Amino acid sequence: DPNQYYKIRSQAIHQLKVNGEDPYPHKFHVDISLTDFIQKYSHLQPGDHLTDITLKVAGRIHAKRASGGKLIFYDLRGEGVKLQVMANSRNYKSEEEFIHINNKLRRGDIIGVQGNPGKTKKGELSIIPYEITLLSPCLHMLPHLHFGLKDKETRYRQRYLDLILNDFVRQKFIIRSKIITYIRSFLDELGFLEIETPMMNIIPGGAVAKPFITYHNELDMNLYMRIAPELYHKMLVVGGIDRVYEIGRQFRNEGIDLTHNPEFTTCEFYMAYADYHDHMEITEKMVSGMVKHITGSYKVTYHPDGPEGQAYDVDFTPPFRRINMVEELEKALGMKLPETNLFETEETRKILDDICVAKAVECPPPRTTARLLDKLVGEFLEVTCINPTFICDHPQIMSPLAKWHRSKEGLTERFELFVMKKEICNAYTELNDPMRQRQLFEEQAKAKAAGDDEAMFIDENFCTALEYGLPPTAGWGMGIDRVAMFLTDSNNIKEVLLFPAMKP
Amino acid sequence: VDPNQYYKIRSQAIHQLKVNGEDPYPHKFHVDISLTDFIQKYSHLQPGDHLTDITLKVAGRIHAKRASGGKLIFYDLRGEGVKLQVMANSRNYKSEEEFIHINNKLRRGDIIGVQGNPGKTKKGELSIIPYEITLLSPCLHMLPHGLKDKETRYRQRYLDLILNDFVRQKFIIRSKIITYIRSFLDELGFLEIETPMMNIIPGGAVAKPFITYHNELDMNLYMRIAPELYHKMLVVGGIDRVYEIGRQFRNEGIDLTHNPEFTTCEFYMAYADYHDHMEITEKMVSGMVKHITGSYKVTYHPDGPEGQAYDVDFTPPFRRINMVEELEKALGMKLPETNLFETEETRKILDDICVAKAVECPPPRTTARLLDKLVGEFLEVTCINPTFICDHPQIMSPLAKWHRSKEGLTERFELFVMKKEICNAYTELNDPMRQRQLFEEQAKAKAAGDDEAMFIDENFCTALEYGLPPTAGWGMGIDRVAMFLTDSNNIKEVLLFPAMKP
Ligand SMILES: NCCCC[C@H](N)C(=O)NS(=O)(=O)OC[C@H]1O[C@@H](n2cnc3c(N)ncnc32)[C@H](O)[C@@H]1O
Ligand SMILES: NCCCC[C@H](N)C(=O)NS(=O)(=O)OC[C@H]1O[C@@H](n2cnc3c(N)ncnc32)[C@H](O)[C@@H]1O
């Protein structure tokens, strides 16, 4: 049936073209939006019909229900709003044209309506047409009215169908766009300069991740899509721009799940003369201010198991709870780990390997200390973070760009913010010692030769830039898509991306 | 001393500080007041003043170090695009012994923190008289004594930003351009959106794409050449006004107006045509210039600082010209009628004209590419003032709607400012059957050698079959705007890290 509808209607539209009835006209002058139309005329009473007033509106027909031969009702929708078109024969331009236009219209068509405001006897605000014009015909059958567009696959591969039929979808992407606008306002007020840095790199850096590779024909050159803008931003602080930020796309050649898309949006900012303690206060102020400004409360209802699951109230009232990674993991495991100045030994790596096997937490090769630690932290600590929680003082061996902790040997001045069991922020006091930064780069290169696809390349250009003097600096990064996730009560990142990445 | 030996000497000294526990890279320095706020708060003092009442802490980079006998040193402290003098006096320092110790280790380029009192030299220089100077980050290299070489400026942009304050102003202007556009469109009800930068099939422009591969999904992907197709699908979805400031990627050569990655603004407006967008462009571009510059006039130096200067007036209305007629005027010849611009005889006529007028066109010598070369040689070079070039032939606009009076042409315009293309906009083609036919012609051109021809996007065609309302779209090169608002003839001047040959 849907296949035959498409052929029949495609035939009808083609006949209109050759009949000189252009079904795709160039311009239709809209006098008033549907939203402004309702707020301007909702006050009317049943039976009213303002003959004095004539406006032109436009939208998509969601339903067409005829009653007699001289009267048809059209469900006109647009802007997330609805308006009824009460097409009467005696009010139309002519009786012959009234029969002609109604024979041509179908559900799904884009039409323009010129007429008078009115209200039906049943109490529906309506537009009484003098002339209806077909603007763009719909050649397909749209999902039936009883049950419409629930399958996840079609909603994500035809997002325009999702937006036409489900008005909860358009509200999520308004929220997501309100989140980003809030960030810019927050940082612009603080004197940060919004900058743009290359997304194609001779050598990628700024995170531990597998990159996408590409090739430039003219330069006969292999390039990588950026995994993070971190290194370029620190070069800007060397250049004397003490506060920079950038909201931009990152690309990571990794697997898709409920919180990972191969391309995603982050905000990174860098502030001269601040440390990671300063960024804990800024993070609290920004996240809490943003949740309250978007939702309307400092509390967010969160459904980990879908609508028919448990509901958890997440409180974003500062200050957020802080836990030290290694110290709290000793508590969660119920055993003492080697002291932090021993984390580079092989005896320590096999201790953490044994713990992973004993507690069944699982780790694909290479089974590095840093990777085993990350798996243990995810299993025992990150799952307990429902409320916004800072996990602090990461070991140096998992933080190649973070400055060493000023009191705790083996650790760094780093924190991550976790909300509703997922990582939201990553920030630390920046390592500005160029000699120590080279040593950590050369260790990353050995890890890569030892199997880690995510280990960092040696970036000698960046090390040279640090030799010109980077002031004491603290940086910060946040996954915007994950923020939109917990602010729209979405457990699937595909819900907050307009066109998520999909298998063919 | 040699720069290489300077680097070795200073690296050794710094390393000696590290192993002796002297911490040349301290973790945190509490700054009490910014240099800018220090100057406005204390510019009012009089020559000779020295306030014992006030003790603040500032920080910055040493740009100069001139001794005045041994008990007095002057430091030129810079930061935030501003300057402040540090009058290091021996009798005012923490101790005479520490005064000699800190000044002997400090060099030009170092990041330092200064705790002291505000003051003013007898000559009238606002100064801070330090009680204690702290080294925050040493500079291990010799900085240029200026820095005018273009290759070094573009490969070490941090050196450019430290030494040249006209560079820092250009990038402040660029961010003011982007912030202005967002304010302009947000006020008009546009929703800022994000659309995929990795595509199964690239589209929305005529360009050669970058190719990549996703391992887990075992899939070849392309970096986007434009977001146009995704935006129109959102208009089908009922979001009547969308826009996006984002990066585009084009596998082509670098020149004075082309970078392989660049930033554009694209917006799409339901129920508007390209006539509506010409007025929006006038309002936005003129308003943007005046809010940034302060007037509607911008000085333009096509031949560098030592060349002629032209005052470019951005007061609306902008001049409008029709592409084909003005190209016929420049050529001194009549072209075939516009309804013949897709025939092979017309391509052969344009081919002959290109050789006769010595305008080169690398293969394939298609009508669209020969026309593009002719427009670049004869029309686009004469556009100094903001100029609309309108009504492009359909064969150069596979996504633009046909012109309602002139068959063979489209409802399209481009904005040219100071010899550069700035905007591209047209009434969107929303006939799905006609859009498919033009996709099939582009596909044959690709099989005929054009790597820049468009792929057939059946997903987009399917979306057009659900009904795209009459719509007009618009695209602006952000980097190209920053070029003519900073009087830059080289796009590398308005990119923080431009693409360079290795
Ligand atoms: N200078 C301090 C660190 C600054 C940020 C640092 N350069 C960085 O890249 N940190 S990150 O953990 O690798 O990414 C930052 C956030 O992006 C989010 N994100 C990360 N990977 C993905 C993926 N694959 N998909 C979607 N969202 C993601 C996530 O919430 C991170 O907290
Ligand atoms: N729907 C109407 C058309 C919308 C815009 C369309 N998607 C498009 O891509 N137009 S474009 O001509 O191909 O690019 C838009 C602008 O980007 C600028 N630009 C284009 N290519 C480059 C390159 N290589 N480098 C730097 N800047 C560039 C240039 O000013 C263009 O006017």
UniProtKB/Swiss-Prot annotation, chain B:
GO cellular component terms, A-Z: aminoacyl-tRNA synthetase multienzyme complex; cytoplasm; cytosol; extracellular space; mitochondrial matrix; mitochondrion; nucleoplasm; nucleus
This enzyme's EC code(s): 2.7.7.-, 6.1.1.6
Annotated residues for binding of ATP: 250-252, 258-259, 421-422, 477-480
Positions of post-translational N6-acetyllysine modification: 18, 71
Any one GO biological process: response to X-ray
Catalytic activity: tRNA(Lys) + L-lysine + ATP = L-lysyl-tRNA(Lys) + AMP + diphosphate
Phosphoserine PTM positions: 137
Reported impact of residue 35 to H: In CMTRIB; severely affects enzyme activity
Keyword field: Acetylation, Aminoacyl-tRNA synthetase, ATP-binding, Cell membrane, Charcot-Marie-Tooth disease, Cytoplasm, Deafness, Disease variant, Host-virus interaction, Intellectual disability, Ligase, Membrane, Mitochondrion, Neurodegeneration, Neuropathy, Non-syndromic deafness, Nucleotide-binding, Nucleus, Phosphoprotein, Protein biosynthesis, Secreted, Transferase
Reported effect, residue 137 to A: Strongly reduced production of diadenosine tetraphosphate (Ap4A). Reduced protein phosphorylation
Top-level taxonomic group: Eukaryota
GO MF assignments: amino acid binding; ATP binding; ATP:ADP adenylyltransferase activity; identical protein binding; lysine-tRNA ligase activity; protein homodimerization activity; tRNA binding
Post-translation changes: Phosphorylated on a serine residue after mast cell stimulation with immunoglobulin E (IgE).
Disease with which this protein is associated in UniProt: Charcot-Marie-Tooth disease, recessive intermediate B: A form of Charcot-Marie-Tooth disease, a disorder of the peripheral nervous system, characterized by progressive weakness and atrophy, initially of the peroneal muscles and later of the distal muscles of the arms. Recessive intermediate forms of Charcot-Marie-Tooth disease are characterized by clinical and pathologic features intermediate between demyelinating and axonal peripheral neuropathies, and motor median nerve conduction velocities ranging from 25 to 45 m/sec. Deafness, autosomal recessive, 89: A form of non-syndromic deafness characterized by bilateral, prelingual, moderate to severe hearing loss affecting all frequencies.
Further remark: Shares a bidirectional promoter with TERF2IP/RAP1.
Subunit details: Homodimer and tetradimer. Part of the multisynthetase complex (MSC), a multisubunit complex that groups tRNA ligases for Arg (RARS), Asp (DARS), Gln (QARS), Ile (IARS), Leu (LARS), Lys (KARS), Met (MARS) the bifunctional ligase for Glu and Pro (EPRS) and the auxiliary subunits AIMP1/p43, AIMP2/p38 and EEF1E1/p18. Interacts with AIMP2 (via N-terminus) and MITF. Interacts with TARSL2. (Microbial infection) Interacts directly with HIV-1 virus GAG protein.
Family note: Belongs to the class-II aminoacyl-tRNA synthetase family.
Function recorded in the entry: Catalyzes the specific attachment of an amino acid to its cognate tRNA in a 2 step reaction: the amino acid (AA) is first activated by ATP to form AA-AMP and then transferred to the acceptor end of the tRNA. When secreted, acts as a signaling molecule that induces immune response through the activation of monocyte/macrophages. Catalyzes the synthesis of the signaling molecule diadenosine tetraphosphate (Ap4A), and thereby mediates disruption of the complex between HINT1 and MITF and the concomitant activation of MITF transcriptional activity. (Microbial infection) Interacts with HIV-1 virus GAG protein, facilitating the selective packaging of tRNA(3)(Lys), the primer for reverse transcription initiation.
Protein name in the entry: Lysine--tRNA ligase
Organism expressing this protein natively: Homo sapiens
Shown stretch of the complete protein: 71 to 575 of 597
